[PDB]
C-alpha cells in the first residue's frame, strides 16, 4: 500500500478487543485510546468523531501514526477520547489523499453511517466471568432424577381438572388422553443436578448452570409460580438448593461453577396465593376478593374472569408493577426479603437471574417495551447489583436487546436469538429455529453477525447466551434432519464465537425434538460419554475456549466468506494468541489457503488445528489446511 488517493478497506480494522482499546469498561475517570489498523503508509490522517451525550453534539479528535505491527505489513493510528461520566459513541473517517472512508461497528463504508457506532458507556459492567464462561441450561424434570422419593406420580394431584401423569425415563413427553402436556413428569430434580455436576463440570467442562423456573409451581415447566420463596417440592427444597449451590460454588469438584435462576417476575400462575383462582388458600386472592390485600397486585378489566395476562394465557396473570416504591416491586426486587435479593443473599448466594419476558413487565396491565419498563428494570439493576455487583442479570428478548443493554443501566445480556440462534441455523440447517425452510449463504451469514453484535456494546456482545436450542424452539439437530456433523460444525462456531456458549442440555450428543413440549426430553446418560463424537467434540472445544482468552474476549475479524465453496473464516485475537476459525458448511472437503496473515501471524511461525492436533507452518502469509464437509479447524498460536 501507499498513498495513492486510495483507502484499502482490507487493511482497515477495529473492534474494542485488547490491541485497539486500552479500556474496553472504563470509569468516568478513565480515557480510552482507541487505535485502528491500515495497511503499512495507506493513508494520509485518520480522526475519531464520537457523539457526547453529555452535550448532543459531535466532536473531533485527530489521530496520529502509533506503530508497525510485528510483520511489518500494518499501520496502527491513535487516538484517545476524554474521561466522563458520559455515553458515547464513535466512527472513524480516514483519508489517503482524495479517498476517504468510514469505519465503525458495521465496517469499511464509502459514506458517512449514521448507525453501527462503537459505544463508550462509563461506568457499565458486566461480570468478567460470564464473558468468559460456558452455560448449560438445565430444564430440571428432564436432566437426572436424583431421587425418586419426590417424583410426582400420576394422579399425584390436579390442576384445573387435570390429573398429573410420570412418564418412565426416556419415553415421550406426550400427554396421553386424559392428561395434559404442562403436566407430564418424569422425575428430574436438584438432587439429580447435584450428582451430575461431575459431568458439567469435568466431563463436558461448562462452569455455569442456568435453571429453568425450580420454585413452586403446578407445571412441569413451572412459569406459573406459585410460590417464589420454595422450591418446587417435586424438585427438592430449599436446603437441597442450598446444597446444590455449594456443590456448584465448589472449586473441589472442577472449576469454580456459578448459578444462574429462571426469574419468572411479569406474571404468577393463576394459584398463587395473591391470586389465588382455584382457592388452594385459606386467605382471599385477588380473583377471589375485591377486598384482597393483593388486589392491586394485578388487574381486571373484568372482574374476576377478565385479567391482564402473558399473552392473553389466563393461567398467567399478570403483575402490576405501579410507581416506585410499590409493593409489588418491593416483593419483587426491593426488599431485602424480595424474590431477587433473598436468593442473592446468604444463605444462597446465586449468581444471576434470567429475566422471564422481560419486555413485558409494566404497570396498569401494559404490554412494555416503554418508558415504565425501562424504569423497573433499571431499578432491578440497582438491587441486584446493589447486593452483588458481580451477579449476572440476563434477560429474554429475542430481537435486538439494544433498549434494555445499550444505556449500561438495566441488563448485562439478553438471550441471543437474533445474533446467534437465528443466523447459525439459517446457515447450517437451511431451516429458521421454528424448523421452517430459511437459509443463508456464508456472506449473508457473515454479514448477519456482525449486523447484530453491532447492535451491542462490547462487553455486552462477550456476555450474550449464546444456544443453538432452547426450551422454547426446536431442536438443533431436528432443524439438521439428523445430520451429526451439522452439530459439530454448530458445536465449533459456537465454542469460537462471541458471547457466553450456552449449551442446552442434551444438544452437546445430538438429541432431537420438535417443537414445545417435544423441546424437553428426557437426557439419555448412556448418550452423555465421549463415545458420543458430538460430546467428545464438546469437550474438546470448552477445554480450547478456556485455554485462550482471545475466544472469549478477543478481537473478531472476518478471513474469508466464500459461497462457492461455503468456507467461512475468522479469527479470534488479543495480545498474546492469535487464532483463525476454519469453517466449512459444504457437504463435501475442501483444502483452503487461511490468510492468517490478516492476523499477523509471523511467517515461518506455527498453528496447531485444535480440532485434530495436527500441526501447521505459516508460509507466505498463508496456512494451507483440509477441512472436512460439515466440519471445522481452530488454527491458534
Ligand atoms: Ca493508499
Ligand atoms: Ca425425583
Ligand atoms: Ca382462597
Redesign the pocket.
Given at each position: 500500500?501507499?498513498?495513492?488517493?486510495?483507502?484499502?478497506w482490507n487493511g482497515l480494522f477495529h473492534d474494542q478487543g485488547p490491541l485497539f482499546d486500552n479500556a474496553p469498561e472504563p470509569t468516568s475517570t478513565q480515557s480510552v485510546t482507541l487505535k485502528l489498523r491500515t495497511?503499512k503508509?495507506?493513508?494520509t490522517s485518520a480522526n475519531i468523531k464520537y457523539w457526547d451525550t453529555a452535550d448532543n453534539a459531535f466532536h473531533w479528535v485527530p489521530m496520529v501514526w502509533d506503530s508497525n505491527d510485528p510483520t511489518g505489513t500494518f499501520d496502527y493510528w491513535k487516538g484517545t477520547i476524554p474521561a466522563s461520566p458520559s455515553i458515547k459513541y464513535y466512527r472513524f473517517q480516514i483519508n489517503?489523499?482524495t479517498?476517504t472512508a468510514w469505519y465503525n461497528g458495521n465496517g469499511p463504508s464509502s459514506t458517512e453511517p449514521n448507525a453501527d457506532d462503537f459505544y463508550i458507556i462509563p461506568n457499565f459492567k458486566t461480570p468478567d466471568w460470564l464473558k468468559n464462561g460456558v452455560m448449560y441450561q438445565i430444564f430440571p424434570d428432564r436432566f437426572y432424577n436424583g431421587d425418586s422419593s419426590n417424583d410426582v406420580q400420576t394422579g399425584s394431584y390436579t390442576y384445573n381438572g387435570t390429573p398429573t401423569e410420570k412418564k418412565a425415563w426416556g419415553s415421550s413427553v406426550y400427554a396421553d388422553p386424559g392428561y395434559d402436556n404442562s403436566l407430564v413428569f418424569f422425575g428430574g430434580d436438584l438432587a439429580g443436578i447435584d450428582q451430575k455436576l461431575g459431568y458439567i463440570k469435568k466431563t463436558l467442562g461448562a462452569n455455569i448452570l442456568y435453571l429453568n423456573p425450580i420454585f413452586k409451581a403446578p407445571t412441569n415447566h413451572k412459569y406459573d409460580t406459585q410460590d417464589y420463596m420454595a422450591v418446587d417440592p417435586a424438585f427438592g427444597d430449599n436446603s437441597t438448593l442450598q446444597t446444590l449451590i455449594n456443590d456448584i460454588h465448589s472449586t473441589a469438584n472442577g472449576p469454580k461453577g456459578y448459578l444462574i435462576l429462571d426469574g419468572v417476575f411479569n406474571h404468577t400462575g393463576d394459584s398463587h396465593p395473591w391470586f389465588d383462582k382455584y382457592n388452594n388458600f385459606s386467605s382471599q386472592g385477588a380473583y377471589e376478593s375485591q377486598s384482597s390485600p393483593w388486589y392491586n397486585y394485578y388487574t381486571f378489566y373484568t372482574w374476576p374472569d377478565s385479567y391482564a395476562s402473558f399473552l392473553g394465557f389466563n393461567s398467567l396473570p399478570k403483575l402490576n408493577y405501579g410507581n416506585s416504591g410499590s409493593a409489588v416491586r418491593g416483593v419483587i426486587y426491593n426488599n431485602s426479603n424480595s424474590v431477587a435479593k433473598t436468593y442473592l443473599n446468604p444463605p444462597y448466594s446465586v449468581d444471576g437471574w434470567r429475566l422471564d419476558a422481560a419486555q413485558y413487565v409494566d404497570a396498569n396491565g401494559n404490554n412494555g417495551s416503554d418508558v415504565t419498563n425501562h424504569q423497573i428494570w433499571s431499578e432491578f439493576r440497582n438491587a441486584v447489583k446493589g447486593v452483588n455487583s458481580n451477579a449476572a442479570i440476563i434477560g429474554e428478548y429475542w430481537g435486538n436487546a439494544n433498549p434494555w443493554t445499550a444505556q449500561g443501566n438495566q441488563w448485562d445480556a439478553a438471550t441471543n436469538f437474533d445474533g446467534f440462534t437465528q443466523p447459525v441455523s439459517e446457515w447450517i440447517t437451511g431451516k429458521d429455529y421454528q424448523n421452517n425452510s430459511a437459509s443463508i449463504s456464508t456472506t449473508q451469514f457473515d454479514s448477519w453477525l456482525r449486523g447484530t453484535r453491532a447492535n451491542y456494546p462490547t462487553n455486552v456482545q462477550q456476555s450474550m447466551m449464546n444456544f443453538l436450542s432452547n426450551h422454547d424452539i426446536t431442536r438443533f439437530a431436528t432443524r439438521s434432519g439428523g445430520d451429526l456433523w451439522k452439530t459439530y460444525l454448530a458445536l465449533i462456531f459456537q465454542m469460537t464465537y462471541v458471547g457466553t456458549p450456552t449449551i442446552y442440555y442434551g444438544d452437546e450428543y445430538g438429541m432431537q425434538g420438535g417443537a414445545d413440549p417435544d423441546n424437553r426430553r428426557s437426557f439419555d446418560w448412556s448418550q452423555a460419554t465421549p463415545s458420543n463424537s458430538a460430546v467428545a467434540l464438546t469437550q474438546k472445544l470448552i477445554t480450547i475456549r478456556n485455554q485462550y482468552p482471545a475466544l472469549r474476549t478477543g478481537s473478531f475479524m472476518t478471513l474469508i466468506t466464500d459461497d462457492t465453496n461455503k468456507i467461512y473464516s475468522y479469527g479470534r485475537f488479543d495480545n498474546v494468541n492469535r487464532i483463525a476459525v476454519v469453517l466449512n458448511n459444504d457437504s463435501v472437503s475442501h483444502t483452503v489457503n487461511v490468510p492468517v496473515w490478516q492476523l499477523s501471524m509471523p511467517n515461518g511461525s506455527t498453528v496447531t488445528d485444535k480440532i485434530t492436533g495436527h500441526s501447521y507452518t505459516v508460509q507466505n502469509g498463508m496456512v494451507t489446511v483440509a477441512v472436512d464437509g460439515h466440519y471445522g479447524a481452530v488454527l491458534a498460536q
Open positions: 500500500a501507499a498513498n495513492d488517493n486510495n483507502v484499502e495497511f503508509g495507506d493513508i489517503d489523499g479517498s
